[PDB]
Design a binder for these strands. Structure first.
Ligand code: ZN
Lengths: 86, 52, 119, 71, 50, 100
RNA sequence: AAACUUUCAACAACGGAUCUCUUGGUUCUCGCAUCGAUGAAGAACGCAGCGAAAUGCGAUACGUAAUAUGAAUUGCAGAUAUUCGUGAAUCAUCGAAUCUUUGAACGCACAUUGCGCCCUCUGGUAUUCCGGAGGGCAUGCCUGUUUGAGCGUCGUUU
RNA sequence: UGCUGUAAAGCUGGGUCGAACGGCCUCUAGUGCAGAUCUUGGUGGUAGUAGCAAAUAUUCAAAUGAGAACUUUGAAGACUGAAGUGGGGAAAGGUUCCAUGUCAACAGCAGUUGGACAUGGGUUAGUCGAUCCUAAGAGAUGGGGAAGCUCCGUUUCAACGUGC
RNA sequence: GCGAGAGACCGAUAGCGAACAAGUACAGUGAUGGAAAGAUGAAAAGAACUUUGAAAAGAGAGUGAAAAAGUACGUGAAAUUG
RNA sequence: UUGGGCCCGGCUCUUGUCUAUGUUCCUUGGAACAGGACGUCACAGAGGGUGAGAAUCCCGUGCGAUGAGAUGACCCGGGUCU
């Protein structure tokens, strides 16, 4: 009865949604995310999982602030406003 | 070619006794890639013989 | 295309807040009519008008704070330069150009000469 | 929703998800100059908040609905 | 269950709104390639994993 | 593994050598950029020469006694003999070596 | 002899090879140095006149300002939209802003949209209770300020 | 349709087709398949075959509909037989709920029916739960280890009240 | 990372896993695993209308250079089949 | 032998604007961007688009010219004030 009968007793989630990465890897009893390592300050990442770095890294989200650093750098980090031509 | 082309898989040979060739195969389930051959120059999606 | 931003910049605090209230009741009235039209493109115009009046109110209040803090040693951090974290930690021009009196005497005593050869 | 405006003297509004019954009661007073007997709220299956606002007997909810303009 | 958290119920609201057919006026746009919504989900077939 | 009358070889390729293969595809590009850097440096300070005057010294070891080559800088005694201070000499295109 | 089986050809199927393309990939070279507590990278949830996704954005939500430019957008619809012009469209440019809930993530807590406390204003007959608005309260370390502790200790007076 | 070559193959008639391609002198290589229980994709014979046989059991009529063994209604015959095939809940699911429309796919026959498909609607709390308490336990701080990721410890060798 | 220029490179089973709403769909409690999928036509001109059918469709017709291009879309091999 | 501050230039970087010559005739074709004839420009016969292989139809290419913004104790040339 270790197959089909035992598979009927699965109604207790070991993991729930993580607050940092939202992935359902937050171990309830350990209070740790198996994916991002939350609540540790650093993000969980390993050099033996290079494909895992691809899945969650810079560029996989919005880059809502790094989008524009190149364009601000190219203008010398301007302060002020543009002047209307005469 | 890319140094890792055809080698971005965790494929493992099923061994003998399962009526299939001993080529490494993709693990897991739920996708059609699962159980498919990998790493071989004869395999679709493997790396070429003697990559350039 | 709604209100003109240069006309808004010539108004006082009371006139801008008064127009914001009028725009919000217009948007509220449109959302009631949207229940029956139901396609009502004018909602887009009023929504961007609210954004403009809110923008002009915010900008006007920000030069007032800028004028208050002009020349002061300490100003709010949102009115400071926002280059990068690293560029803010960098030495200022005055600090970077600091020099010991020993080093200033040697620089002055032996400047790089300008010369040529074959004469 | 319109059966409540007529029978139960109740106005039904979509409301911001972050607002509570104290803020909803104030808002209808400021927007429509009407006193709420109570505010019953509800978060809908689509993720928006619905408020059942019953007015005191001083106000006729059907008259208020016409004034807003959806009946 | 009937007893659910707000965070759970908020994920179930988004899952309902993403489970709609393609609006038909989108197929008339120029250089349009989407013929149907390819991310449909039936409750009995594929589970949300929430 | 050892067959025929052949020389015995020492091919040191038992480590992960292929991760440390430097192929100089950029030889011509580096030549050109090096020339451009050299032009920019020259045009910055013209007509002042780009090269400091270097001494002439004997190459060390019994194998290179016969040869003589450019040193690093003129000694303090040599500059003393021509009446130039080392601090001053460094500013008129003369190289100094306190060690020789 | 039919039927049936097999072979071949024509046409029709099944299937997607072949050929030809290619806003993709791969490799080489050249140039540059710019993330974050002034809150990053990432996550969640939202936002369009009619949108599920992708893309963009944040309750100012497929965007606001500004500069430039100069008549579109377009699948349909529609101006309390525009045309010898402060003027259509435009992530063209971009220097001003907005930037939900979070996240190193900072009042405490978090499988909870849980629970405080301080300041100013405001509503309810209120320094104390209840409600609302705005502004605040993390840790280590440095410099300084103030208030202190210790017969650690100096001076003086019985 | 034939011709040439021992051959690998080359050329050609007819049909189809629609945007590039070849001969020769050389260069170059990811260059020739029948096999590898080869790889991926596709297709057969088997074969209209095995089979679609547990849970007592269905029938008549009318309505609807193009179409009714299977939908609806009526009449009957039955069963579960209160440790139920009844009426609720916890976990888990997540809109499957309800109305209207609806049958391409799915419901291994069928289908006018459906937990399917499409469009809408729907969950109202001072008193029911959560929220609060502590349980086994988990775990910051002061400290002590550890190169470090971090480990120990839970008032602990602490000047510990955001006191009333 | 940002910005460029290239190649005796690959040409959709190749080249990155991804030329496409690709780290997507989907699987797994989890760490992780991880596809398939490009091509009508110059232009939708994406077949008005009549007729048979409950309908899907079919037959006429129509557009087009071509329907021996009808979205089950260039060409359309073989296995297999009428 | 010799200090410091500004103002205009140059250099460096970014960016705006501006530029030669057929769409002449015949044939095929749905379309000429194909073939033929006559040409033109070329410091431009790179590349792309447009109904088929387009220097000459369009964008560009080549040649330069001319504005705007920046930037630099630690680049130089002039001024100018101490
Ligand atoms: Zn996580």
């Amino acid at each position: 009865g270790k197959g089909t009968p035992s598979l009927g007793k699965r109604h207790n989630k070991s993991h729930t949604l993580c607050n940092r990465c939202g992935r359902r890897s937050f171990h309830v009893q350990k209070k740790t995310c198996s994916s991002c390592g939350y609540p540790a300050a650093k993000m969980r990442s390993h050099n033996w999982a290079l494909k895992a770095k691809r899945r969650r890294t810079t560029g996989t989200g919005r880059m809502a602030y790094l989008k524009h650093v190149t364009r601000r750098f190219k203008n010398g980090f301007q302060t002020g406003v543009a002047k209307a031509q005469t | 070619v890319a140094e890792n082309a055809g080698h971005q898989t965790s494929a493992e040979s099923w061994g003998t006794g399962r009526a299939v060739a001993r080529i490494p195969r993709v693990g897991g389930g739920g996708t059609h890639r699962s159980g498919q051959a990998a790493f071989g120059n004869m395999c679709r999606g493997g790396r070429m013989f003697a990559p350039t | 295309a709604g209100v003109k931003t240069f006309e808004l910049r010539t108004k006082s605090k009371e006139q801008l807040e008064s127009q914001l209230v009028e725009l919000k009741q217009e948007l509220a009235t449109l959302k009631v009519q949207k229940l029956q039209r139901p396609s009502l493109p004018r909602i887009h115009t009023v929504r961007k008008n609210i954004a403009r009046v809110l923008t002009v109110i915010n900008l006007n209040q920000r030069e007032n704070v800028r004028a208050f803090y002009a020349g002061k040693k300490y100003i709010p951090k949102d009115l400071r330069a926002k280059k990068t974290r690293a560029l803010r930690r960098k030495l200022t021009k005055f600090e970077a150009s600091q020099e010991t009196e020993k080093a200033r005497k040697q620089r002055i005593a032996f400047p790089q000469r300008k010369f040529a050869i074959k004469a | 929703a319109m059966k409540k405006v007529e029978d139960g003297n109740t106005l039904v509004f979509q409301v911001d998800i972050k607002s509570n019954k104290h803020q909803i009661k104030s808002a209808v007073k400021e927007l429509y100059d009407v006193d709420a007997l109570y505010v019953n709220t509800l978060i809908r299956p689509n993720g928006t908040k619905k408020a059942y606002i019953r007015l005191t007997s001083d106000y006729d909810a059907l008259d208020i609905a016409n004034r807003i303009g959806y009946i | 269950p009937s007893q659910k958290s707000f965070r759970t119920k908020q994920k179930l609201a988004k899952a309902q709104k993403q489970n709609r057919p393609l609006p038909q006026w989108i197929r008339l746009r120029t250089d349009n390639k989407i013929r149907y919504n390819a991310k449909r989900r039936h409750w009995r077939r594929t589970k949300l994993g929430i | 593994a050892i067959s025929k009358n052949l020389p015995l070889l020492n091919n040191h390729f038992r480590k992960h050598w292929q991760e440390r293969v430097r192929v100089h595809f950029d030889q011509a590009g580096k030549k050109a950029s090096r020339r451009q850097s050299r032009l920019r440096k020259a045009a910055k300070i013209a007509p002042r020469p780009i090269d400091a005057l270097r001494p002439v010294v004997r190459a060390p070891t019994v194998k290179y006694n016969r040869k003589v080559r450019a040193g690093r800088g003129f000694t303090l005694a040599e500059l003393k003999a021509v009446g130039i201070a080392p601090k001053y000499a460094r500013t008129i295109g003369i190289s100094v070596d306190h060690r020789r």
